[PDB]
Amino acid sequence: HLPLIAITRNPVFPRFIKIIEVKNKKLVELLRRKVRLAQPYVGVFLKRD
Amino acid sequence: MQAGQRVVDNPIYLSDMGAALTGAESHELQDVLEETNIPKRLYKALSL
């Protein structure tokens, strides 16, 4: 139950470890707000052209 | 400046930057700058 993430030119193929490095620091706010939750998780989606 | 970041907003500059690594004499550079078509300059830059 989280708002969509900013893929920003980064393909994450199924069952293929990948790294994401956005230059903006606002997505880190969402990554630190999930630390108190019991299970922390995130979804990965794809962008259009 | 990676090819996977899609940050190459100016491809002409990327092809020129790649041709800049060539050690060819200045004349070759001038001749490549004279080239107007795109496959010729890419083909020649690769040749250099």
Swiss-Prot record, chain B:
Signal peptide: none annotated. Duodenum, heart, lung and liver, but not thymus. It comes from the Eukaryota. It is found in: Mitochondrion matrix. Disulfide bonds: none annotated. Homohexamer. Organized in a ring with a central cavity. The ATP-binding and proteolytic domains (AP-domain) form a hexameric chamber, while the N-terminal domain is arranged as a trimer of dimers. DNA and RNA binding is stimulated by substrate and inhibited by ATP binding. Interacts with TWNK and mitochondrial DNA polymerase subunit POLG. Belongs to the peptidase S16 family. ATP-dependent serine protease that mediates the selective degradation of misfolded, unassembled or oxidatively damaged polypeptides as well as certain short-lived regulatory proteins in the mitochondrial matrix. Endogenous substrates include mitochondrial steroidogenic acute regulatory (StAR) protein, DELE1, helicase Twinkle (TWNK) and the large ribosomal subunit protein MRPL32/bL32m. MRPL32/bL32m is protected from degradation by LONP1 when it is bound to a nucleic acid (RNA), but TWNK is not. May also have a chaperone function in the assembly of inner membrane protein complexes. It is linked to CODAS syndrome: A rare syndrome characterized by the combination of cerebral, ocular, dental, auricular, and skeletal features. These include developmental delay, craniofacial anomalies, cataracts, ptosis, median nasal groove, delayed tooth eruption, hearing loss, short stature, delayed epiphyseal ossification, metaphyseal hip dysplasia, and vertebral coronal clefts. The Lon N-terminal domains are crucial for the overall structure of the protein, maintaining it in a conformation allowing its proper functioning. The AP-domain (ATP-binding and proteolytic domains) has a closed-ring conformation in the presence of AMP-PNP and its N-terminal entry gate appears closed. Upon ADP binding, it switches to a lock-washer conformation and its N-terminal gate opens. This is Lon protease homolog, mitochondrial. The chain holds residues 318 to 365 of 959 of the full protein.
